[PDB]
Amino acid sequence: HPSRVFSMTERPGHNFAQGSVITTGRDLDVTIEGSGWISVLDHTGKEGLT
Amino acid sequence: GLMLGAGSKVVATQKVHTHGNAQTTTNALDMMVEGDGFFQV
């Protein structure tokens, strides 16, 4: 009889909504307006979106 | 269709180059520009 059903937790996705923007008056502080990403490469040397 | 603002900021400091009044002085070396123009130093 189909009486036993397991449940396992998963990560379906992420919250891509805009974060809280902190104004600092600093030249080298940039916040992405709306949706977007900045291409950076990590220590290994593989491109990734931050 | 829901818009949320992120606040406000001061983007520029605008200088108003309106000609000021005139002060009459007895010094012979201080001068004024009657109109548009800057002394070059």
Automatic annotation (TrEMBL), chain A:
GO terms for cellular component: bacterial-type flagellum basal body, rod. Its main location: other. One of its GO terms (biological process) is bacterial-type flagellum-dependent swarming motility. Coiled coil: none annotated. It is found in: Bacterial flagellum basal body. Keywords: Bacterial flagellum, Cell projection, Cilium, Flagellum. The basal body constitutes a major portion of the flagellar organelle and consists of five rings (E,L,P,S, and M) mounted on a central rod. The rod consists of about 26 subunits of FlgG in the distal portion, and FlgB, FlgC and FlgF are thought to build up the proximal portion of the rod with about 6 subunits each. Belongs to the flagella basal body rod proteins family. This is Flagellar basal-body rod protein FlgF. It comes from Vibrio alginolyticus.
TrEMBL record, chain B:
It is found in: Bacterial flagellum basal body. It comes from the Bacteria. The basal body constitutes a major portion of the flagellar organelle and consists of four rings (L,P,S, and M) mounted on a central rod. The rod consists of about 26 subunits of FlgG in the distal portion, and FlgB, FlgC and FlgF are thought to build up the proximal portion of the rod with about 6 subunits each. Belongs to the flagella basal body rod proteins family. This is Flagellar basal-body rod protein FlgG. It comes from Vibrio alginolyticus. The chain holds residues 65 to 105 of 262 of the full protein.
